Structure formats: structure tokens, C-alpha cells
């Protein structure tokens, strides 16, 4: 139960799952901790050790602001970090099947959180059910978020930008050099993540230094062409210097600002991160991926459009009600505690919150496209409209356009539409199939009947886990043995996609066709 890696021995622990055993190695370090001189730098290789590292508990989460908008509410607190925050957080986790497999496919998980939050130690990210049920090895890693992971002064190796993407990339290399010792096949590595984690997975498809570190990709509710995912390199510099003044760290030697920011206390940087943008939205990515000239050599949209990415199979998908979660973090007349029926003027107020820097005409064009009704006095007309707007603009339409663009360079792609509202979902029912609430199905939590899910949820999670596993091993997300719906390839022309629900599973075409022609062709011009 001790494994010898390239930097020394590590001790794990075994776990009982479904009357079998999984071996967990929680908290293997994969880089020299990025403190002091190393804060804001790319991660550095990890010096050998001759003891036995004890990988028996999750390591520290990375520094980050907590969501304190619904204290005590499980719906928001289940996403808050559940281990000590620290700048010493570059660690990873590995769940291997027991008995040790011999050439197992490796699934590498990248959590979301808008590039400002998240941690690999969340309960819904527990890879033990996947290791037990599909006999894959599951790896997740922590990576720097917010200013600590994405502060950008282009070219300056003191704060080059994209450091958190490089933490991810060094985790992938760790798996390349070391996963053979755990019984895994480095030649069969599938990346999957959700939200900002999905956008990260898509950026690894573009970054040449990641080409050789993984085989396939799975993108849940996210991609790099979402409007919140990448920021221009000049908007990045404006933000790092606005943080510089806010901490009184202003200089004309850019390098001297960095070493000034290197002496400030993480809490001081965290509490100023929010204000480096002129007007915030509940979707703001204050510090995030940029075109840095190293991880990312051009605007991702050019690279996607011109076929400059890793050629491979992708699995891409979204939830029915991506946008609702954000409405109760700032939209007036909205609350998780009533059913949030809003008015036409409340709707228009909501647009100013989510599209603050957008012209009067832009906002009416949004209102005009979403507010001519199949019936004008459904009292929830404007409430549903505002949720669709946020979800279609921020998630569904970027994921559809990514998939279109990706598949027209010849690779197989599969698109799902997740529309089961979980029975354990703590938010009110008007919020529907919320952002992030497919993750528990992917990780196979409903497989554990000890814990509150209907039998129908267990069965739906059982096939999702099988399709995901079959996609990782074989490049094809079919459930073959149980007479399931066949998942058609998503072609650029007909655009078939698969719906995922408890009743049964249907092939449909051209998800949100009218809404996406608005968002992806009209609205970019305004
Ligand atoms: C004005 N406010 C409101 C509050 N917030 C601060 C922190 N944020 C996180 C909050 C807001 C968002 C997401 N829920 C988690 C969640 C809640 C409920 C269900 C499922 C998930 C909490 S975030 O980490 O900045 C960020 C995150 C996710 C993102 C996804 C896409 C794009 C950007 C994102 C940004 C900004 C200031
Ligand atoms: C680029 O940065 C300037 C400077 O930023 C601001 O100062 C920070 C400390 C923080 O308080 C931000 O909210 C400020 O915006 C921005 O310039 C300003 O515009 C805002 C409102 O638009 C105004 O409050 C400030 O007085 C302006 N500051 C100056 C120095 O004139 C600017 O908006 C940023 N954005 C872009 C796109 O360049
Ligand atoms: C739904 O609730 C929102 C606000 O949630 C509430 O906040 C307090 C007002 C309190 O009543 C809590 O118990 C509620 O759950 C309501 O929005 C408020 O409306 C008033 C109207 O005078 C306005 O002044 C406030 O700013 C609003 N609060 C906001 C925008 O956060 C809303 O009216 C409720 N609607 C329904 C149909 O129940
Ligand atoms: C590492 O841990 C050793 C203890 O072994 C076991 O660790 C966990 C799983 C506990 O359940 C404990 O009862 C076990 O015996 C220590 O002997 C060793 O000193 C530790 N090393 C370091 C560096 O802390
Ligand atoms: C694992 O599979 C690869 C091909 O996918 C092969 O080249 C390698 O030798 C295998 N290793 C084993 C079976 O230990
Ligand atoms: C000041 O800036 C120059 C580049 O213009 C740089 O070479 C120098 O190292 C900076 N000062 C310090 C103390 O590093
Ligand atoms: C197939 O169906 C059986 C029930 O007949 C179920 O127990 C099994 O787990 C299913 N397999 C998959 C991959 O869903």
C-alpha cells in the first residue's frame, strides 16, 4: 500500500466501496510550493524526498474568497472549500482500483469555480465510485485560482499569467511520468471538468505543451469561447495594476510592483480582487486565462476557427437551466426563498446587472428576442426569460459553437443535454436543472443507495458513468449491453444530441437554434 514515484515513496490508504476496495492517495504534491519568491511564478519541479510521504488526507485548498451569500445553506456551502486554505496547495489525488489494475484508463478531473474558486476535495468530486465501478484510475489536482493563479503582466516571468493553467499542466505531466506505477496507462488519459474546469480542458486542447499529455476531452457546461473564459491581454494588465494601486503597490518598474505584491498578505490580495473591474456581474472572472504568448499563443477563437488544436474525440454538454443559479446573486426581485416572479421592468433591471457595459440598443435587442411570448401573461414569463438569457449567452451557445467548430475538422464529437433535476437538490424548484448538478451523476454518487437518491437516479447515474467510461477508454460514449439509445455523432450539419433524463433518452437536433443565432452572430456585433 506504498508506491514508489519518481520523487520518492508515498503511502496511501484503502477504502471499502460497494463491498469492494479502492485505494486512495490523497494529497500527493506535484510542485514546489509557490510561496515567497515563487508566488505568481510558474510552478517549479518538485525536489526528491527520501521519507515516505503520507497521502492519507486531502491537502490544503488554494487561497480564494468564500461564497457567504447564503450562510448555512447547503446549496451554496457544498461548493465552498472543505480544507484549509493555503498558498501551499499544489497537490493531487489518485483513486486506483483494488486489485491494482495493469493498464487502466486514467480520468483526470479539473474542477470549476470561475477560475476564482474550487478545490479537488469536494464531496461531489470523490473519485472512489468511478474507480470501483468502471475500474479506471481517477486523478484530480488543485491549481491556483484568482489573482494568485492568473495575475498577468505579459512577458514578465514574475507574473506572466496563466499560472493556474500551468499548475494543471504540471499535474498532467506528473500523471505521464508516474501513473504507470499505480497501474494506469499514460497513453489513455481523458481530461474532464465542469464550468471553468471545462473551459480549462478546452484550453488544453489548444495549448501545444499539453498536446502530448492527454488523449481525449470531456467538457461539462463550459468552454474557452464562453464570454467569461478568456480576457484580452490589455484588459489583464489594466486589472493587475488596478489591484496594484488598491494595495498601494504602484511603481513604474513592473517587476517592482510584483515583488511589492509578493510581500502583501494573501487576505489583502483577496479582498481587493473584486474591485479591479469597473462594474461587476455575478459572472465576473476578475483574474483568469489570458493570451500570454506561452500557454496560449493567440486568441482562442482564431485557433478554433482555423483548426489549430489537438485532433481527437470530445464529449460536450450542458444542463437545462444553466443560468438560474446566477439570478439569486444579484438580479432584483429574485430569491431562493420565493418563486421569484418578476415584472417586465424587473427583467429590464436584470439585463443591466448581467450586461452592464452593453448599449441601450444591445439590451433592447436582448429583450426583443426573448420577450415575445407563446402567451403574454404567464406570470413567470420574465423570470424564465432572464434565466434563459444568462444560460444561453454564458453556457449553452458557446458550448454548441465550440462543438460545431471542433467537429468540422473531422473529429467525432458527442453532445448531451442534461435535464434531470436531482431529488436532493436544495435550491427551489423554479431554478430547475441547475449549473453543476450533473456532476454528482457523473461521479456516481446516486450509485450509493445509503444516501437519498431515487432508484431512477441510480439507474441514470449508472449509464452516465458507463458512457463516460466507455468514452474515456474507447472514444465512444455508448452503453452497449442494456439495449440503450445509441449516442449519435454530432455532425456540423444536422447537430444531433442526446438528452439525459430518468424517464428515457432521446435523440434531438439543433439545440436552441433560434437563440444561438442571436447570441453567436448578432450580439457579438453590438
Ligand atoms: C455580485 N457577486 C455574486 C458572488 N460572486 C463571488 C464568487 N463566485 C462564486 C459565486 C457566484 C457564481 C457561482 N456560485 C456557485 C454556485 C452556486 C449555486 C449553484 C452552483 C454553483 C457562487 S466566482 O467564484 O467569482 C464565479 C463562479 C462561477 C462562474 C461560472 C461562470 C462564469 C463565472 C463564474 C464566477 C461575484 C460577486
Ligand atoms: C482600466 O483602469 C482604469 C483605472 O481604474 C479604476 O480604479 C480601480 C482602483 C478601481 O476602483 C476601478 O473600479 C476603477 O475603474 C479604469 O478607469 C476609470 O473608470 C471608472 C469608471 O469607468 C472610474 O471610477 C475611475 O475614476 C476611472 N479611473 C481613471 C484612472 O480614470 C478603467 O475603467 C479600466 N477599464 C478599461 C476597460 O480600461
Ligand atoms: C421575492 O423576494 C425578493 C427579496 O427576497 C426578499 O428580501 C426581503 C425584501 C424579505 O422580504 C425576504 O424575506 C425576501 O425573501 C423581493 O424583492 C424585494 O421587493 C421589494 C419591494 O418593495 C424591494 O424593495 C426589495 O429590494 C426586493 N429585494 C431584493 C430585490 O432583493 C420580491 O419582491 C419577492 N417577490 C415575490 C413575488 O415574492
Ligand atoms: C506516516 O504515517 C505512519 C502511520 O501509519 C499509518 O497512517 C494512518 C493511515 C493511521 O491510520 C496510522 O494509524 C497508521 O499506522 C507514521 O508511522 C509515520 O511516522 C507517518 N509519517 C509522517 C512523515 O508523518
Ligand atoms: C498498455 O497499453 C499500451 C497500448 O495501449 C501498450 O503499448 C503498453 O505496452 C501496455 N502496457 C502494459 C500492458 O503493461
Ligand atoms: C527595473 O526595471 C528594469 C527594466 O526596465 C529591470 O532590469 C530591473 O531589474 C528593475 N529593477 C529591479 C530592482 O529589479
Ligand atoms: C444493466 O441493467 C442491469 C439490470 O438488469 C443493471 O443492474 C446494470 O448495472 C446495468 N448496466 C449498466 C451499464 O447500466
XYZ file of C-alpha atoms and ligand atoms in Angstrom:
705
model
C 0.000 0.000 0.000
C 3.154 2.090 -0.575
C 4.005 3.172 -4.132
C 7.369 4.420 -5.362
C 7.034 7.504 -7.548
C 9.864 9.376 -9.266
C 10.312 11.739 -6.301
C 10.011 9.127 -3.556
C 7.664 6.733 -1.842
C 4.097 7.617 -0.924
C 1.714 5.808 1.407
C -1.974 5.656 0.666
C -4.990 4.043 2.265
C -7.704 1.655 1.233
C -11.430 2.228 1.320
C -14.492 -0.002 1.292
C -16.855 0.766 -1.594
C -19.826 -1.400 -2.582
C -18.329 -4.466 -0.947
C -15.033 -3.968 -2.771
C -11.889 -1.904 -2.207
C -10.497 1.316 -3.709
C -7.025 2.632 -2.868
C -6.840 6.392 -2.314
C -3.721 8.583 -2.386
C -4.994 11.986 -1.259
C -2.536 14.861 -1.270
C 0.494 13.882 -3.335
C 2.438 17.091 -4.030
C 3.302 17.727 -7.638
C 5.265 21.017 -7.485
C 7.461 23.042 -5.151
C 5.007 25.151 -3.084
C 4.601 28.606 -4.704
C 5.319 30.871 -1.737
C 7.565 33.837 -1.125
C 9.753 34.320 -4.165
C 7.653 31.798 -6.113
C 4.265 33.489 -5.643
C 2.913 34.478 -9.114
C 5.533 32.361 -10.915
C 5.004 29.257 -12.988
C 5.180 26.122 -10.824
C 8.609 24.571 -10.312
C 9.526 20.883 -10.381
C 9.470 19.126 -7.036
C 12.691 18.195 -5.242
C 13.218 14.497 -4.422
C 12.279 13.136 -0.992
C 13.550 10.030 0.756
C 10.962 9.621 3.544
C 7.534 8.102 2.914
C 5.059 10.824 2.024
C 1.727 10.203 3.741
C -1.086 10.697 1.219
C -3.970 9.857 3.511
C -5.926 13.151 3.681
C -6.803 15.940 1.276
C -4.240 18.734 1.227
C -4.911 22.438 1.581
C -7.178 24.144 -0.899
C -5.761 27.206 -2.710
C -6.450 30.706 -1.362
C -9.776 32.086 -2.517
C -12.791 34.099 -1.412
C -15.708 32.133 0.024
C -19.337 32.467 -1.109
C -21.015 33.945 2.005
C -24.285 34.926 0.277
C -26.316 32.089 1.878
C -24.556 31.211 5.138
C -25.591 27.808 6.441
C -27.406 26.878 3.226
C -26.219 23.515 1.898
C -26.970 24.598 -1.689
C -24.111 27.068 -1.663
C -21.919 25.652 1.050
C -21.464 22.275 -0.660
C -19.252 24.209 -3.143
C -17.206 26.093 -0.521
C -13.686 24.795 0.225
C -13.616 22.000 2.784
C -9.942 22.012 3.685
C -7.607 24.708 4.986
C -6.871 27.457 2.512
C -3.171 27.981 1.951
C -0.751 29.164 -0.648
C 0.826 25.716 -0.282
C -1.841 23.892 -2.296
C -0.284 22.280 -5.442
C -1.276 18.691 -4.631
C -3.176 15.952 -6.472
C -5.311 12.889 -5.645
C -5.391 9.397 -7.156
C -8.007 6.665 -6.747
C -6.841 3.344 -8.181
C -8.973 0.191 -8.290
C -8.156 -2.657 -5.929
C -6.787 -5.008 -7.045
C -4.246 -2.699 -8.718
C -5.157 -2.769 -12.407
C -2.449 -3.278 -15.002
C -3.149 -0.817 -17.861
C -6.124 1.236 -16.660
C -7.594 4.230 -18.433
C -6.964 7.422 -16.461
C -9.616 10.086 -15.907
C -8.227 13.492 -14.872
C -10.726 15.846 -13.201
C -10.451 19.664 -13.340
C -12.948 21.483 -11.060
C -14.709 24.693 -11.994
C -15.362 27.775 -9.942
C -14.919 30.631 -12.413
C -11.076 30.460 -12.030
C -11.536 32.164 -8.641
C -12.804 29.238 -6.519
C -12.971 25.471 -6.139
C -10.953 22.602 -4.709
C -10.418 18.943 -5.617
C -11.522 17.773 -2.163
C -15.260 18.495 -2.592
C -17.568 15.606 -1.755
C -19.123 15.581 -5.240
C -15.598 15.162 -6.712
C -14.835 11.935 -4.868
C -13.338 9.621 -7.459
C -13.799 6.397 -5.469
C -17.074 5.292 -7.089
C -15.573 5.598 -10.572
C -12.507 3.581 -9.605
C -14.624 0.837 -8.081
C -17.375 0.583 -10.723
C -15.538 1.155 -14.009
C -12.017 0.202 -12.873
C -10.450 3.430 -14.110
C -7.887 5.487 -12.244
C -9.243 8.925 -11.292
C -6.908 11.873 -10.729
C -7.815 15.394 -9.576
C -5.470 18.270 -8.741
C -5.564 21.642 -7.008
C -4.475 24.632 -9.052
C -4.040 28.295 -8.188
C -7.130 30.478 -8.673
C -7.874 34.167 -8.673
C -5.058 36.691 -8.683
C -2.669 34.139 -7.191
C -3.107 31.890 -10.251
C -3.843 34.340 -13.066
C -2.265 37.734 -12.325
C -0.865 38.886 -15.660
C 1.941 41.155 -16.769
C 2.719 39.711 -20.241
C 6.272 38.525 -20.764
C 7.344 39.293 -17.235
C 8.199 35.871 -15.737
C 7.407 37.385 -12.337
C 3.680 37.403 -13.205
C 3.329 36.003 -16.743
C -0.307 34.965 -16.448
C -1.994 31.572 -16.715
C -0.068 30.155 -13.748
C -3.097 28.082 -12.725
C -3.275 26.600 -16.223
C 0.405 25.685 -15.809
C -0.350 24.043 -12.424
C -2.915 21.915 -14.271
C -0.337 21.166 -16.959
C 2.298 20.078 -14.480
C -0.245 17.760 -12.907
C -0.796 16.179 -16.314
C 2.960 15.681 -16.731
C 3.081 14.092 -13.270
C 0.492 11.570 -14.464
C 2.555 10.973 -17.596
C 5.749 10.212 -15.642
C 4.199 8.391 -12.658
C 0.792 6.858 -13.269
C 2.326 3.641 -14.661
C 3.447 2.868 -11.097
C -0.212 2.944 -9.948
C -1.299 0.524 -12.687
C -2.506 3.175 -15.125
C -1.954 3.727 -18.821
C -0.415 7.155 -19.548
C -1.320 6.557 -23.193
C -5.064 6.524 -22.269
C -5.758 9.765 -20.334
C -9.114 11.542 -20.584
C -9.454 15.071 -19.203
C -12.830 16.059 -17.839
C -14.012 19.146 -15.979
C -17.084 21.283 -15.482
C -17.649 25.041 -15.947
C -14.270 26.808 -15.584
C -12.832 23.304 -15.432
C -14.429 22.558 -18.810
C -13.059 25.838 -20.208
C -9.659 24.691 -18.894
C -9.991 21.344 -20.629
C -10.811 23.109 -23.866
C -7.756 25.358 -23.465
C -5.562 22.278 -23.074
C -6.881 21.247 -26.498
C -5.249 24.459 -27.840
C -2.010 24.587 -25.896
C 0.863 22.804 -27.686
C 2.629 21.990 -24.434
C -0.428 19.936 -23.426
C -0.892 18.051 -26.738
C 1.135 15.042 -25.601
C -0.251 14.865 -22.044
C -3.739 13.520 -22.744
C -5.853 11.509 -25.205
C -9.467 12.754 -25.093
C -11.543 15.524 -23.545
C -14.922 15.866 -21.825
C -16.398 19.376 -21.362
C -19.307 19.828 -18.942
C -21.106 23.224 -19.091
C -18.061 25.175 -20.213
C -15.572 26.032 -22.972
C -12.951 28.657 -23.708
C -15.221 30.585 -26.087
C -17.732 31.407 -23.372
C -17.771 35.201 -22.809
C -16.292 34.812 -19.278
C -13.432 32.440 -20.033
C -10.555 34.438 -21.594
C -9.625 38.099 -21.204
C -7.622 40.239 -23.590
C -4.043 40.841 -22.608
C -4.555 44.584 -22.225
C -7.625 44.131 -20.004
C -5.470 41.787 -17.928
C -2.756 44.413 -17.444
C -5.320 47.071 -16.508
C -6.588 44.679 -13.823
C -3.243 43.770 -12.281
C -2.312 47.446 -11.986
C -5.722 48.426 -10.588
C -5.004 45.800 -7.938
C -1.554 47.393 -7.525
C -2.944 50.806 -6.585
C -5.683 49.250 -4.424
C -2.849 47.713 -2.369
C -0.724 50.865 -2.696
C 1.890 48.802 -4.594
C 2.154 51.184 -7.573
C 5.536 51.605 -9.299
C 6.872 52.212 -12.798
C 9.192 49.190 -12.657
C 6.623 46.483 -13.394
C 8.931 43.948 -11.739
C 8.989 46.078 -8.563
C 5.176 46.028 -8.361
C 5.318 42.226 -8.332
C 7.829 41.978 -5.528
C 5.712 44.557 -3.713
C 2.606 42.401 -4.193
C 4.746 39.483 -3.017
C 5.009 40.990 0.485
C 1.314 41.662 0.949
C -0.728 39.082 2.910
C -2.949 36.755 0.830
C -6.055 38.109 2.566
C -5.145 41.592 1.410
C -4.858 40.498 -2.222
C -8.084 38.503 -1.945
C -10.189 41.378 -0.683
C -9.060 43.739 -3.450
C -9.527 41.230 -6.308
C -13.209 42.149 -6.518
C -12.715 45.811 -7.405
C -10.205 45.651 -10.269
C -13.184 45.617 -12.669
C -15.276 48.795 -13.177
C -18.660 47.100 -12.793
C -19.030 43.507 -11.683
C -21.619 40.890 -12.516
C -22.269 37.635 -10.658
C -20.320 36.050 -13.561
C -17.171 38.203 -13.406
C -13.830 36.458 -13.809
C -11.619 39.086 -12.205
C -8.373 37.180 -12.802
C -8.407 34.420 -15.376
C -6.895 32.998 -18.543
C -5.297 35.454 -20.957
C -3.397 35.306 -24.213
C 0.022 35.034 -22.565
C 2.174 34.034 -25.538
C 3.274 30.856 -23.716
C 0.360 28.623 -22.707
C -1.824 30.356 -25.292
C -0.310 31.886 -28.418
C -3.350 33.587 -29.985
C -6.958 34.479 -29.317
C -8.541 31.036 -28.840
C -11.291 31.959 -31.297
C -8.767 32.264 -34.142
C -7.185 28.909 -33.233
C -10.557 27.148 -33.070
C -11.750 28.718 -36.301
C -8.573 27.835 -38.194
C -8.251 24.242 -36.988
C -5.284 24.820 -34.650
C -5.914 22.342 -31.839
C -5.419 18.736 -30.768
C -7.368 16.445 -33.116
C -9.298 13.918 -31.007
C -12.805 12.960 -29.801
C -14.732 15.265 -27.476
C -17.809 14.853 -25.325
C -19.599 18.139 -24.674
C -22.787 19.010 -22.860
C -24.918 21.407 -20.855
C -27.751 21.408 -18.313
C -31.276 22.619 -18.982
C -31.157 25.604 -16.571
C -27.555 26.833 -16.615
C -28.460 30.424 -15.860
C -30.842 30.222 -12.905
C -28.138 29.821 -10.224
C -26.767 33.272 -11.012
C -30.114 35.062 -10.824
C -30.271 34.936 -6.994
C -26.797 36.515 -6.722
C -27.805 39.982 -7.848
C -30.937 40.116 -10.001
C -33.680 42.217 -8.368
C -36.906 40.520 -7.382
C -35.128 37.152 -7.325
C -34.666 34.960 -4.299
C -34.222 31.321 -3.495
C -36.973 31.738 -0.859
C -39.893 32.805 -3.080
C -40.733 31.779 -6.637
C -39.191 34.975 -7.965
C -41.979 36.081 -10.317
C -40.583 39.317 -11.761
C -42.007 42.061 -13.977
C -41.072 43.479 -17.355
C -39.263 46.325 -15.587
C -37.565 43.897 -13.204
C -36.468 41.868 -16.233
C -35.007 45.015 -17.804
C -33.281 45.754 -14.492
C -31.762 42.278 -14.606
C -30.241 42.981 -18.022
C -28.350 45.994 -16.677
C -26.837 43.718 -13.996
C -25.710 40.947 -16.329
C -24.838 43.223 -19.292
C -23.609 46.391 -17.574
C -21.209 47.589 -20.249
C -23.749 46.992 -23.044
C -25.556 49.660 -25.093
C -29.181 50.611 -24.563
C -29.862 49.142 -28.001
C -27.998 45.947 -27.174
C -30.157 45.445 -24.108
C -33.386 46.044 -26.037
C -32.244 43.582 -28.694
C -31.925 41.012 -25.884
C -35.354 41.990 -24.558
C -36.896 41.806 -28.020
C -35.547 38.324 -28.831
C -36.559 36.776 -25.505
C -39.853 38.562 -24.784
C -42.427 37.876 -27.454
C -44.466 35.093 -25.943
C -46.453 31.993 -26.813
C -48.814 33.707 -24.246
C -48.238 37.129 -22.719
C -49.469 36.740 -19.112
C -47.886 33.555 -17.897
C -46.809 35.155 -14.589
C -43.338 33.517 -14.786
C -42.698 34.817 -18.323
C -39.984 37.279 -17.351
C -38.471 35.011 -14.675
C -37.877 32.203 -17.160
C -36.718 34.670 -19.823
C -33.962 36.033 -17.621
C -32.713 32.555 -16.749
C -32.611 31.524 -20.421
C -30.738 34.712 -21.377
C -27.978 34.087 -18.830
C -27.722 30.379 -19.621
C -27.862 30.748 -23.410
C -25.334 33.587 -23.526
C -22.916 32.207 -20.982
C -23.023 28.442 -21.466
C -25.293 26.679 -23.958
C -24.495 28.717 -27.093
C -20.667 28.821 -26.569
C -20.666 25.051 -25.994
C -22.722 24.453 -29.137
C -20.464 26.699 -31.251
C -17.304 25.115 -29.850
C -18.684 21.691 -30.827
C -19.764 22.804 -34.321
C -16.371 24.365 -34.929
C -14.454 21.463 -33.464
C -16.308 18.723 -35.314
C -15.919 20.327 -38.723
C -12.207 19.477 -38.669
C -13.089 15.809 -38.962
C -13.194 14.561 -35.376
C -16.022 12.675 -33.677
C -17.949 14.750 -31.131
C -20.885 13.934 -28.878
C -23.286 16.416 -27.356
C -25.587 15.794 -24.390
C -28.384 17.846 -22.860
C -28.801 17.118 -19.151
C -32.318 17.731 -17.905
C -32.894 15.733 -14.719
C -33.484 17.866 -11.633
C -31.866 15.978 -8.764
C -34.176 14.837 -5.969
C -31.605 16.011 -3.362
C -31.227 19.445 -4.966
C -31.561 22.066 -2.175
C -32.477 25.105 -4.323
C -36.154 25.859 -5.080
C -37.770 24.067 -7.980
C -38.178 27.161 -10.187
C -34.407 27.058 -10.636
C -34.690 23.724 -12.439
C -31.690 21.714 -13.653
C -29.043 23.993 -12.253
C -25.459 24.627 -13.265
C -23.196 21.980 -11.739
C -25.832 19.478 -10.675
C -24.966 16.857 -13.253
C -21.612 16.386 -11.548
C -22.961 14.055 -8.863
C -24.377 11.823 -11.608
C -21.063 11.735 -13.460
C -19.226 10.772 -10.243
C -21.759 8.081 -9.434
C -22.977 9.371 -6.106
C -26.543 8.084 -6.759
C -24.969 4.646 -7.015
C -24.849 4.750 -3.195
C -28.371 3.842 -2.076
C -27.420 4.584 1.565
C -27.971 8.253 0.580
C -31.303 9.612 -0.539
C -31.482 9.252 -4.357
C -34.399 7.540 -6.089
C -33.797 4.219 -7.816
C -34.339 6.009 -11.142
C -31.483 8.382 -10.327
C -29.255 5.396 -9.516
C -30.024 3.901 -12.914
C -29.433 7.195 -14.785
C -26.131 7.693 -12.969
C -25.174 4.093 -13.772
C -25.450 4.640 -17.522
C -23.826 8.100 -17.473
C -20.875 6.555 -15.637
C -20.778 3.767 -18.218
C -20.997 6.131 -21.215
C -18.284 8.427 -19.753
C -16.096 5.401 -19.002
C -16.639 3.950 -22.454
C -15.826 7.343 -23.933
C -12.588 7.573 -21.954
C -11.437 4.020 -22.801
C -12.702 3.702 -26.379
C -13.550 7.173 -27.677
C -17.282 6.346 -27.994
C -19.899 7.053 -25.235
C -22.193 4.086 -25.812
C -23.911 1.847 -23.268
C -23.966 -1.302 -25.363
C -25.147 -4.235 -23.229
C -28.501 -2.965 -21.890
C -30.326 -2.018 -25.133
C -29.714 1.712 -24.707
C -30.275 4.612 -27.055
C -27.303 4.872 -29.378
C -25.493 8.192 -28.982
C -25.087 9.641 -32.497
C -22.039 11.585 -33.535
C -22.674 15.353 -33.540
C -22.176 16.487 -37.163
C -21.756 20.096 -38.220
C -24.852 19.883 -40.443
C -27.583 18.019 -38.547
C -26.277 18.503 -34.989
C -27.852 15.546 -33.249
C -27.598 15.480 -29.447
C -28.614 13.104 -26.669
C -30.884 14.033 -23.779
C -30.142 12.609 -20.326
C -33.108 12.138 -18.011
C -34.586 9.429 -15.800
C -37.574 8.573 -17.992
C -35.808 7.750 -21.214
C -33.252 9.067 -23.542
C -33.958 10.801 -26.840
C -32.090 11.940 -29.930
C -32.884 15.543 -30.858
C -31.397 18.070 -33.295
C -30.212 21.684 -33.239
C -30.498 22.657 -29.592
C -31.632 26.278 -29.133
C -31.289 27.071 -32.825
C -33.075 30.458 -32.719
C -31.397 31.670 -29.509
C -27.913 30.793 -30.667
C -28.157 32.636 -33.999
C -28.943 35.678 -31.860
C -26.083 35.234 -29.413
C -23.349 33.939 -31.648
C -23.972 36.044 -34.774
C -25.992 39.179 -33.897
C -24.877 40.070 -30.341
C -21.061 39.973 -30.883
C -21.519 42.992 -33.178
C -23.315 45.173 -30.616
C -22.318 40.015 -7.361
N -21.439 38.828 -6.952
C -22.016 37.475 -6.584
C -20.969 36.426 -5.982
N -19.623 36.202 -6.778
C -18.393 35.753 -5.906
C -17.878 34.255 -6.118
N -18.179 33.456 -7.335
C -18.997 32.296 -6.989
C -20.473 32.582 -6.644
C -21.238 33.223 -7.801
C -21.185 32.341 -9.031
C -21.434 30.834 -8.779
N -21.818 30.433 -7.325
C -21.515 28.915 -7.080
C -22.775 28.101 -7.229
C -23.975 28.486 -6.599
C -25.151 27.742 -6.756
C -25.183 26.595 -7.538
C -23.997 26.197 -8.190
C -22.807 26.936 -8.040
C -21.235 31.340 -6.198
S -16.915 33.230 -8.636
O -16.039 32.328 -7.972
O -16.417 34.565 -8.788
C -17.523 32.531 -10.153
C -18.086 31.228 -10.147
C -18.578 30.571 -11.239
C -18.574 31.111 -12.540
C -19.090 30.429 -13.682
C -19.060 31.031 -14.911
C -18.514 32.320 -15.030
C -18.016 32.967 -13.935
C -18.018 32.404 -12.636
C -17.517 33.064 -11.451
C -19.367 37.519 -7.569
C -19.943 38.802 -6.886
C -8.951 50.453 -16.621
O -8.470 51.008 -15.389
C -8.910 52.346 -15.090
C -8.420 52.631 -13.692
O -9.326 52.099 -12.733
C -10.174 52.178 -11.652
O -9.508 52.225 -10.410
C -9.526 50.999 -9.662
C -8.671 51.230 -8.429
C -10.960 50.578 -9.338
O -11.534 51.490 -8.426
C -11.803 50.534 -10.632
O -13.170 50.327 -10.256
C -11.654 51.842 -11.444
O -12.352 51.753 -12.672
C -10.436 52.493 -15.196
O -10.786 53.872 -15.159
C -11.863 54.500 -14.574
O -13.223 54.446 -14.853
C -14.015 54.256 -13.675
C -15.432 54.045 -14.154
O -15.442 53.704 -15.534
C -13.866 55.457 -12.742
O -14.475 55.129 -11.498
C -12.405 55.823 -12.493
O -12.361 57.153 -11.987
C -11.549 55.760 -13.769
N -10.135 55.786 -13.433
C -9.240 56.591 -14.016
C -7.822 56.443 -13.553
O -9.562 57.412 -14.867
C -10.996 51.877 -16.470
O -12.417 51.882 -16.398
C -10.484 50.454 -16.615
N -11.106 49.773 -17.751
C -10.660 49.736 -19.018
C -11.508 48.951 -19.981
O -9.631 50.303 -19.381
C -39.243 37.804 -3.559
O -38.239 38.187 -2.611
C -37.486 39.349 -3.004
C -36.417 39.562 -1.961
O -36.200 38.379 -1.207
C -36.615 39.028 -0.069
O -35.936 40.088 0.580
C -36.643 40.851 1.621
C -37.388 42.004 0.909
C -37.521 39.947 2.545
O -38.908 40.102 2.260
C -37.144 38.491 2.328
O -37.968 37.690 3.178
C -37.437 38.143 0.880
O -37.260 36.742 0.641
C -38.406 40.554 -3.151
O -37.643 41.670 -3.596
C -37.931 42.733 -2.774
O -39.024 43.570 -3.180
C -39.028 44.845 -2.519
C -40.303 45.548 -2.917
O -40.558 46.657 -2.066
C -37.769 45.620 -2.894
O -37.756 46.881 -2.230
C -36.543 44.809 -2.500
O -35.362 45.468 -2.942
C -36.605 43.414 -3.116
N -35.480 42.615 -2.667
C -34.448 42.311 -3.459
C -34.522 42.835 -4.860
O -33.501 41.641 -3.062
C -39.507 40.240 -4.151
O -40.418 41.329 -4.247
C -40.245 38.965 -3.751
N -41.259 38.642 -4.744
C -42.212 37.715 -4.572
C -43.165 37.525 -5.720
O -42.296 37.053 -3.546
C 3.009 8.353 8.202
O 2.020 7.539 8.912
C 2.569 6.482 9.721
C 1.402 5.805 10.393
O 0.878 4.755 9.595
C -0.464 4.944 9.366
O -1.073 6.156 8.913
C -2.519 6.327 9.078
C -3.216 5.582 7.922
C -3.051 5.968 10.515
O -4.221 5.160 10.438
C -1.969 5.275 11.376
O -2.633 4.608 12.448
C -1.195 4.255 10.542
O -0.315 3.469 11.364
C 3.569 7.031 10.737
O 4.147 5.946 11.457
C 4.641 7.864 10.043
O 5.508 8.447 11.010
C 3.987 8.965 9.210
N 4.991 9.782 8.548
C 4.968 11.117 8.583
C 6.074 11.817 7.843
O 4.092 11.734 9.185
C -0.536 -0.693 -22.193
O -1.151 -0.485 -23.497
C -0.285 0.119 -24.477
C -1.111 0.292 -25.734
O -2.356 0.921 -25.450
C 0.979 -0.728 -24.682
O 1.860 -0.103 -25.613
C 1.680 -0.942 -23.345
O 2.828 -1.766 -23.510
C 0.711 -1.577 -22.348
N 1.361 -1.811 -21.069
C 1.152 -2.910 -20.336
C 0.208 -3.925 -20.916
O 1.707 -3.084 -19.260
C 13.814 47.838 -13.015
O 13.448 47.633 -14.394
C 14.490 47.096 -15.223
C 13.925 47.011 -16.627
O 13.465 48.271 -17.097
C 14.938 45.742 -14.670
O 16.016 45.231 -15.449
C 15.360 45.875 -13.211
O 15.724 44.604 -12.682
C 14.234 46.500 -12.385
N 14.651 46.684 -11.001
C 14.861 45.680 -10.135
C 15.289 46.081 -8.749
O 14.718 44.502 -10.455
C -27.817 -3.069 -16.943
O -29.063 -3.433 -16.297
C -28.912 -4.125 -15.045
C -30.298 -4.521 -14.588
O -30.846 -5.523 -15.437
C -28.156 -3.239 -14.057
O -28.054 -3.883 -12.790
C -26.790 -2.924 -14.657
O -25.985 -2.170 -13.753
C -26.982 -2.200 -15.995
N -25.705 -1.835 -16.585
C -25.413 -0.581 -16.958
C -24.052 -0.366 -17.548
O -26.215 0.346 -16.822
